[PDB]
Every structure is written in C-alpha cells, then in structure tokens.
Curated annotation (Swiss-Prot), chain A:
Single GO biological process annotation from the record: mitochondrial translation
Keywords (A to Z) from UniProt: Mitochondrion, Ribonucleoprotein, Ribosomal protein, Transit peptide
Compartmental location: Mitochondrion
Subunit structure: Component of the mitochondrial large ribosomal subunit (mt-LSU). Mature mammalian 55S mitochondrial ribosomes consist of a small (28S) and a large (39S) subunit. The 28S small subunit contains a 12S ribosomal RNA (12S mt-rRNA) and 30 different proteins. The 39S large subunit contains a 16S rRNA (16S mt-rRNA), a copy of mitochondrial valine transfer RNA (mt-tRNA(Val)), which plays an integral structural role, and 52 different proteins. mL53 is located at the L7/L12 stalk.
UniProt protein name: Large ribosomal subunit protein mL53
One term under GO cellular component: mitochondrion
InterPro entries in alphabetical order: mtLSU_mL53 (IPR052473), Ribosomal_mL53 (IPR019716)
From Swiss-Prot, chain B:
Protein name: Large ribosomal subunit protein bL12m, short mature form
Whole-protein coverage range: 46 to 91 of 198
Organism per entry: Homo sapiens
Domain of life: Eukaryota
Species lineage: Eukaryota, Metazoa, Chordata, Craniata, Vertebrata
Cystines in this chain: none
Underlying gene: MRPL12
Swiss-Prot record, chain C:
Compartments, record wording: Mitochondrion
Assembly with partners or alone: Component of the mitochondrial large ribosomal subunit (mt-LSU). Mature mammalian 55S mitochondrial ribosomes consist of a small (28S) and a large (39S) subunit. The 28S small subunit contains a 12S ribosomal RNA (12S mt-rRNA) and 30 different proteins. The 39S large subunit contains a 16S rRNA (16S mt-rRNA), a copy of mitochondrial valine transfer RNA (mt-tRNA(Val)), which plays an integral structural role, and 52 different proteins. uL10m contributes a single cysteine residue to a zinc-binding site with mL66.
Family label: Belongs to the universal ribosomal protein uL10 family.
Record's GO cellular component terms: mitochondrial inner membrane; mitochondrial large ribosomal subunit; mitochondrion; nucleoplasm; ribonucleoprotein complex
Species this chain originates from: Homo sapiens
Gene name of the encoded protein: MRPL10
Lipid metabolism listed as a keyword: no
Effect of R35W: Found in a patient with intellectual disability and ataxia; uncertain significance
Name of this protein: Large ribosomal subunit protein uL10m
Curated annotation (Swiss-Prot), chains E, G, H:
Name under which the protein is recorded: Large ribosomal subunit protein bL12m, short mature form
GN (gene name): MRPL12
Domain of life assignment: Eukaryota
Source species of the chain: Homo sapiens
Length: 101, 46, 109, 32, 31, 32, 31, 31
C-alpha cells in the first residue's frame, strides 16, 4: 500500500477486480484488492474507479486495469502472487504516465 | 451435519431432494382432504 | 477457522482468507445492507449463510429481490382460488355470452 | 383433523422463506 | 358426492404433458 | 382421451337442470 | 339449424314485462 | 324453465362445423 501510494493512480482510469471467493486460488487476487482499496492509494486519484466483482461461476480470478491512454492491463492471479501483480501494476503506471505526458 | 455449498450462478435450477418427497404426496391426496387441509392452513398462518 | 471446521459451516472456509468482517443481524436485512454496501464500489460481498443456507453474492441479491414472507404465505392461499376458479371459468363462457346478447337486443330497439 | 393432514400443517409452516419459494414454484408447474 | 370425488382422481392420474391437451379442449374448443 | 374424463363428460349431458344446479352448488359453495 | 332459429323467435315475441323474469334467472339463479 | 333446458342440450351436441354458424351470426350479423 505504501509503495503503491507513492507512485499514485494518475494514469489509471478504472481498476476491476474479478474473483470467486469460494475458490482456493483467489487469495492473491484478494490481497491485491486490499492494497488497491486502501485509502492512501485511492486518495492519489479520485477519478480512478476501483470495482470488485464477486462471481460464483468457478472462473479463475482476473484483474483488469484501464488507463487513460486506452491501454488495458490484464493480470490473471490464478498462478501469480500479490507482490508480482503489484510490481507489474506499478511498472505499467510508471510507463503509461510517461507516454501520456 | 454439514451445510451444502452455494450453487453456482450459471448452474441450472436445482431443488433439494427433501422437497421432492413432499410434492408427490400433495398430488396423491384428494381435493376434499386438501380443501380441509387448506382451511386449517389459512387459519394457522393467521 | 477451527470453529468452522468442526461446525456445520465447513463450506465457509475459503471465504476467510485475508482480512474479513462479519455483518450479522438477528433478522435478515439483506435489502438494507446491500444498498449501503453499494455506496462503496470496491467493497466486496463474499456471501455468507442465511437461515442455515450458505449463499453467494447473487444469492443475497436474489433473496433481497424476493418479496416478504407474509406475502409469500398468502401466495399459496391465493393460488387455491385460482384452482377452484379454473373449472368454474370453463363453464362461465355461456353466462357471459347470453348476457351480451340480451344487452345488444335493447340497443337495437 | 386426520393425523396425515395435521402432519403437512407443521411441515409447511416450518419451511423458511427461501425454501417455501422452491416448493411453490414446483407445485404450480406440476399442476399445469 | 359420487361425482366430484372421481374428478380429483383424473387430474392426479394425468401426466404433465397430457394436462395441456385437457386444458386446450376446455379453454379453446369450449370457447 | 383418458378413460376417466370420458365418463364425466357424458354424465353432464345426461343430467337434468335440477341435478346440474345441485352439482354446481357444491363447487361454488361447499368448496368455497 | 332449427334449434337456433327457434330461440331467436321466442325472445322477440316476449313482452317487455315478461322479459325481466327470464333475465332474472340468468343473473340470480345461475349466479 | 323448459326453454333454457332445450338450448343447453343443443349447444353441447352441435358439431364443430355447426358451432361456427352460431359464432359467425353473433359476432358479425348482430354487429
């Protein structure tokens, strides 16, 4: 949370978190949701919408990130850790911000 | 002794087997018995 | 978690990974709770158990949309009249036809 | 008044709101 | 009565598919 | 055409006006 | 058919005062 | 009354083709 708050969510338009809470491979996705849903992270950009979708379809968890430039970032947490997804999410922010400005 | 899991949203409608036994019993009984049953049910629910 | 393993709520174990909170009331107030939770778009509803029946997020949504129990109790009572009126309506065509013919006779006069 | 009729009285009232809806839907379709 | 009681046995004995055929005659043919 | 409703249909035609009125009274009043 | 033709003639032949008795049976005796 | 008794018996015994004549008169000839 602290590391992600420093970078901010300026180039991020919408963050969608999809996971099935009754499955055994959604712990990493839920941990990612907790970091993003933090007050410090959300306070960086009030125009960025964080949406948590809870489904019972048995599908693997997925995280969809939409930037202002229109590019989409999709990280599938079925076999990824929370730290890895955060680092990939942070790297895209540091790159999409430079392209826009 | 353990509650069943929540059925999937995309799964077709499923009914517990306990209710299935009750459904067949209602059809067996005559309307006259059910009509007397209905009279008692209406007052009991009030 | 040790409580749930030995109790009847064994299927709620996956729902308690990470930070979790319990919203419990003595009576089902799903419709009140959901609209308050909808004010926070990023707060997930993982599900739970209502009246010893484990439900998902959509189960709570369907439960809220379901009408009140006293109305549902009267639906069975209301359906009894439909069964009785079904056979009666089969022979009700003739009285309706006869009444219309008599009314038209006066109009033509 | 019959013991069999009295048994169904207890079962119907005991069912929960979610459980009653499942029974109500099946009975109407079976009759039709 | 010896008439209404026999009526109940008919509806219960008829299969689900055959109920529609009975209803159609009583709803469309008789109207 | 089940072998039960056929008997009921024929009986109604053979019934007289007085017997029909009593039969209709049970459905309208006794069952309601 | 002859059966329907007889019904039409009877209604027109009845006087207005005697019409009310026939209509009463349909609305009250049968309902 | 005897008049009503005669009418009820006739309608049930009429064939499908004969009923259409009665229906046409009420919906078209009388309207």
């Amino acid at each position: 949370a602290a590391a992600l708050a420093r970078l901010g969510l300026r180039p991020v338009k919408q963050v969608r978190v999809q996971f099935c809470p009754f499955e055994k491979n959604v712990e990493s996705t839920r941990t990612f949701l907790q970091t993003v849903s933090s007050e410090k992270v959300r306070s960086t950009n009030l125009n960025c919408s964080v949406i948590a979708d809870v489904r019972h379809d048995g599908s693997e968890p997925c995280v969809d990130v939409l930037f202002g430039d229109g590019h989409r970032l999709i990280m599938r947490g079925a076999h990824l850790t929370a730290l890895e997804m955060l680092t990939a999410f942070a790297s895209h922010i540091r790159a999409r911000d430079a392209a826009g400005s | 002794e353990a509650l069943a899991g929540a059925p999937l949203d995309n799964a077709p409608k499923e009914y517990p087997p306990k209710i299935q036994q009750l459904v067949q019993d209602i059809a067996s009984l005559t309307l006259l018995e059910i009509s007397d049953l209905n009279e008692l049910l209406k007052k009991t629910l009030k | 978690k040790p409580f749930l393993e030995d109790s009847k709520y064994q299927n709620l174990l996956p729902l308690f990974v990470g930070h979790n909170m319990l919203l419990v009331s003595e009576e089902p107030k799903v419709k009140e709770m959901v609209r308050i939770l909808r004010t926070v778009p990023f707060l997930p509803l993982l599900g739970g158990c209502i009246d010893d029946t484990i439900l998902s997020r959509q189960g709570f949504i369907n439960y809220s949309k379901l009408p009140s129990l006293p109305l549902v109790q009267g639906e069975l009572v209301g359906g009894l009249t439909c069964l009785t009126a079904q056979t009666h309506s089969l022979l009700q065509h003739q009285p309706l036809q006869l009444t219309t013919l008599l009314d038209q006779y006066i109009r033509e006069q």
